[PDB]
Symmetry: D2
Subunit: 414 residues, 4 copies
């Protein structure tokens, strides 16, 4: 009856389109992360508190412009705004910080980039958006520059030119993820071909189970105007339907006049689009094209996803230290929300890259008997689901842990 | 097969993606180096205005790819449009001197439509947020407009907006929420209010008629001047389009009516509107004011899918390349929007201010032509044909049965074209519905049907001018030959190509034929 | 290497048609044979030493045909089976439970050396070539004899024997026999000529309060049973497609239509279905079957059948042990030939959503096993219900079912894919350890019988506590 | 009716769930029936009853019987067929099934009817030394195939007397093959030998087969069922005995052993079709594996669009009884659902007491089974797998069966001279009866090899103008259709013809019946 459910049960994709209902309200919480770019319009601590409230999950620091001192101020203001919501363990929203490299601008790996990457390690950024990646070797050079101290930082390679599109498979192999950087791409290849690059990369990253970001001009007109155009809302919604894990604001939040409204609008479009995904085809095709595995965590993850669909579970609660188990559930694009309980503050921030994943930083100290410790973390996950809406008593939930994460439990919520 | 067509053949127009066993794998195999060689088949509607009224501009626009010229009767005198129609025909008819290359151009009339308007002020006034404005239909205030009093020319507004309902003013610029009904309201979003501005009542069952007194005059002008198509504004139910069809009357019997779905009621009564219409416009401009902006894409995708399944033309409209009004290159959201209207299933895409008043009308037509051509090739025909078969009602219609056999035949052999002979357009429409990769070359003696089948994706109309042959078999054969030789000249057909020829003795014969 | 066995290339074909083209006679069926075999007891199979040979060859269910034989005869049948079963119990990792099914006489009609009837029926209480006595006085008729082979103004020739079956397109006897079965502990009733739900209720009534645990399999044998099938299935524990009478009651050429329908609807309902009668009929006198007969067995498995049956092949013929060996060899090859990709996918869609945590855990475990080519799903069950919910989604991995209930062990033979293992140790204080020991018994038993191998992966399915659902699924590496 | 609700289901499972013993089949039966001609079916009056019960193809088994005996069978068959001229008239094809190469043991010391017992576990020497040709005993078996000693290796197996005795080679040496009896039994004299999994280098044709194919040609048969085909060069041999044009005869290759199953694709490429020869396959490979071989071969033949025969023991018990077993009706039904174009009877028609009943029974089972095929999925899968084609006749064919499915057409009327046009429709398995109008008497017999093709022989001389001559042949198809129940006023039918005489079959037309 709601969240496009009658369209969910269509027997063909054609008929699923026909059953889309503008009065079927999205009920699930919004699962595609919003990356906002920081600038004069979004730098004060008070503006950042607003943006978070509107739905910003990841803060982008664009190292094309601005001195190390400038970006250090940006990072401090973001942390200040975030911590101002750390009243309670269950109210905390992690916010990730991504550093976007300058690269080879014109107005191998530049000496400026090596300094900026050392700055970002020294300040503990979670993510590097690496500009203009053309081949695997370029990724290797960024990882070397990050050094042993930046070992847990994720590398999202920016595909921006013809070479990088044609070497995509080798680039994705060694990357944590991809950004479809439509800005330079649409100067570097014919403008009319970008949607083809975009759809091919999103599809390949979905198949590989690695996050993919759609970027640049998604709501451009909102730099000067309070409502976006019809092409712009279409573009956000279709990025989500393509498969994107994240969507992005650049000038809209970094310099325009309605940064908070831009975040709200991407949040509003993403939630309508997630409900309009035809999971029936998506799940059969990922199952079918995904190879047999003997990784116990992958095997448990696909089993949990099947069981969640079967009982219309409101949520899968996953216990994870590195994010990996949450990333493997995200890949099968459940409709249930994936609540990832973690003690790793960095993994909590990074799992925003994965669609459908809501990170929960657990703070209580361990329990002597591991099974008690597991149960506390699981109840923590349940409590935050109740608070945040999408767990009613009576719901069934799937729980995923270890005892590798290799256990799946089906639990009805009292 | 390589032996006949080469290796390069099977690398082009996304054929490695076309043959994937899932939609996911079809996406993974799209390739920016696979060139789209088939001719662009989604028609382009361009609105005429000061940027595009000169005869020489219009020829450039025709060469760039414009197929349907849209006259927007929201503005302009009857005189003004008669000179639009005249310059269009003069540009179009300057290519008649070589029939093999002549491109028909349809002329469509987009109505002003039933409207809700504020009055004249006491100039400009400013509605400031928070303040309280009165909304009145007392005739004493038609001319007494102030920043706390607004008159509207729609008496029944007081009955169709409930308490807390919203009222939109000047393209959703200003907004008001009702507080009391005696309508006292509070400015939600404020701004400058001019005079005789447009009003929108999101979610309301407005009882304005299907057309306005000025529409009746405008439609009569259109029939008299021989327009091919009406885009009928603000269609909410079937009685609305029956009223447009009565106004056209007998002189206008064969004008196609494309109903513009602009508001919540129209979306919910879609099935009854599409059934008495020749087709649909997804009018996203007004629809983004009348429903939440973030739900327009749902309405778009629902309406295109339902038209596809019915087999009726569907136009996507409004703000596709908006930034090109001032800049020479579009945004990334804008090229994506055009490509995804085509992938969604649209028959036609449209330009408004990009061609009516902007600095780059020819370039915007070029841009839509280039994207469409790329998006057509990325269509996953495998899944689309199968699903259209798996849902579409078994047919005892001989012309439709022929149509599905010929499209399947064309897919089996990589046919370059389906060549069909039609007099109304109906046989080409039935072919267009199954979305062949092959071009549907429609040879007709009806000048008007040739213009009108531009509404159908995949159809290239050719106007045969020669008088009958005594033997019906030789006139048939002469008309196929005109399509072949037109097709070779335009680059749709090469020696060695296969083609499927569809003709009458209903059009119930298909033939497999080699070119030259 | 591993992808050469078990028809694995066929299993990953993108279409059904291409699955058939990839079937390969050199792909060896390594998985253990999971379709259960029912063997009818008779002079060719009632002795303790024959029963032992049958058990070793694959017999899972011993059928007592109560159309013939005294109560004293059948009680020694039961005792002879139990004695052969329990001679293997000094080796608990290899011990095979064997169930006992009672097949009722029902409303048989029969006639009273031989004679040629050439191309008069009385119920007056001495038959000859022109008179036939029938034990059904009330002929109702405005008539077939002997499995339909003779047909007939006076109340299609051939030889007429004696006491031949008669076809006309709950008795007091039936009631003594059902109560006899409860006294003697039978696991299953095959209830002849079921035509509606009321027929099953009457059986459950004659079974009474001591017999609440007995499963009831309704035999579909005539046109009415076929038409009211949905009603019958709803209230029965399962179905038998009794092709014998059905092929006389409706036209012989329509039986396969009824068989494929009943199997499909039983698969959809997750209830067990048996295919019965003449499957290897020529093996009654021959040491090897016909081409039509090995085909019938294989396609019964392909159709969806949970069990397959022998009657005269094992009750009276000269090669009973060979007939069991041959159903076993065929089912093993057919099981590997099933197209699970389509079957599992259609079972998902057609099947309701469920809130039952056991049903939900079960489908997750079958998805997990398919994803990693699990050799087995090890399930703990006391009633057999968890095992049966695993069996209805038709995994390729063996469902090894560990139970303490000796009756449940026997009764789960009805569910395709389930191997029952009876566990005997008294609990431990801690649920945790009691669980682990029963799992480990399953692993060790499975290693010993050739079901599991170091390096394999298994899915283990149990419950978080003792009174609740079966709602834990664990992926485990064999070591 | 025609199980049409089950036809419409969205899944295969649901299709099964909707089958209905009271949904009566209406369409004409499309799977051909081959009957083997022998003493129970040789008389002209008997063959008449057999044509009426539904025989389409008369098979002659040259494993037994003289040329004079078969000549007489052929004459009676043709006399019975010709008796129905003056026509509603069923063409009947004649197939020659060859004896084939064989391997046999020698004579035992005790002579022809003697027996000796080979005891499990004993040592038995298999020898080709001809001084044992008549001296076989319990420890020594002679065989007429010298190269057995170099084609069966240590570990290999030698089967004797229809698979009943089994020996495992233990040692190879100048005296022959030292075996151990794995399966013992009573051995007689001159018993058939099978070498499971061997590459047997016997030739494609026996001496007897050369004389019989010459007889086949001279008496004008339509079909050869060629025995023991292992490899393409065995087919090339059959074809050379038949000559350069092969006189039009169709070569249906019999797959009977392991080598042929594994070299199936190369055999099919050069054959007109296949017979699944389950009798010998069941000796040559484990009996429980034969359904695998059958399902693969039928599948591959459907893919390729070539005819496949299911053969042997389909209704065995009817040799003595008037009603078959439940496993036999099921076997017939499942060969149809599998996709077999043709089904067969051997002893059931050749020597049993119920030959007309057996034909009747296959007829009744095939009709029911044909209505139960799941055309939605089958058609969809035959489309995806069949490759692109620039052959105009094949392009028209797929266009025509898709049109036929769109409107639930009663029939496709096709004009064909060689049968090819009718075979390209048949490979897409339409529900619509394919009505093939031909002037060629031999193509009318031979299209019986294709499921769903009903031949009509046209005897009228050609009109002066092609378009007239075509319309008359089309009209003949309509009017015969009506008379024989294929179509009726109200139906749609597809009409497949050619634009020119001597060109491609490149036209399709949709017609309402009047």
């Amino acid at each position: 009856q709601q969240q496009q459910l009658p369209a969910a049960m269509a027997d063909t994709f054609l008929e699923h389109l026909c059953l889309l209902d503008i009065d079927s309200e999205p009920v699930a919480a919004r699962s595609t992360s919003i990356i906002a770019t920081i600038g004069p319009a979004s730098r004060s601590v008070e503006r950042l508190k607003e943006m978070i409230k509107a739905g910003m999950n990841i803060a982008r620091l664009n190292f094309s412009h601005g001195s190390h001192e400038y970006h250090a101020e940006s990072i401090a203001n973001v942390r200040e705004a975030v911590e101002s919501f750390a009243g309670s363990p269950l109210s905390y929203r992690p916010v990730a910080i991504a550093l976007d490299t300058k690269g080879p601008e014109i107005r191998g790996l530049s000496e400026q980039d090596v300094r900026d990457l050392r700055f970002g390690v020294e300040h503990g950024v979670d993510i590097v958006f690496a500009s203009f990646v053309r081949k695997a070797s370029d990724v290797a050079a960024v990882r070397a520059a990050l050094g042993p101290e930046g070992h847990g930082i994720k590398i999202i390679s920016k595909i921006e030119n013809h070479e990088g599109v044609k070497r995509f498979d080798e680039i994705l192999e060694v990357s944590d993820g991809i950004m479809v950087a439509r800005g330079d791409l649409g100067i570097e290849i014919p403008a009319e071909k970008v949607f083809l690059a975009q759809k091919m990369m999103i599809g390949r990253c979905n198949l590989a189970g690695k996050p993919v970001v759609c970027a640049t001009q998604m709501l451009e007109s909102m730099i000067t105007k309070p409502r976006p155009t019809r092409a712009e809302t279409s573009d956000v919604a279709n990025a989500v339907l393509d498969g994107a894990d994240c969507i992005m604001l650049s000038g809209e939040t970094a310099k325009g006049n309605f940064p908070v409204e831009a975040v709200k609008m991407q949040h509003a479009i993403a939630r309508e689009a997630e409900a309009a995904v035809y999971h029936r085809q998506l799940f059969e095709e990922l199952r079918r094209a995904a190879p047999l595995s003997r990784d116990p965590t992958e095997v448990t993850a696909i089993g949990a996803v099947e069981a969640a669909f079967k009982c219309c579970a409101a949520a899968i609660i996953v216990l994870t230290t590195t994010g990996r188990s949450a990333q493997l559930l995200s890949r099968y694009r459940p409709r249930a929300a994936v609540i990832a309980v973690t003690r790793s503050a960095q993994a909590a921030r990074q799992v925003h890259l994965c669609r459908g994943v809501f990170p929960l930083l657990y703070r209580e100290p361990p329990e002597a008997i591991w099974a008690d410790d597991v149960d506390r973390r699981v109840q923590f996950g349940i409590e935050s689901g109740k608070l945040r809406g999408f767990l009613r008593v009576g719901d069934l939930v799937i729980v995923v842990t270890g005892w590798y994460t290799n256990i799946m439990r089906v639990l009805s919520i009292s």
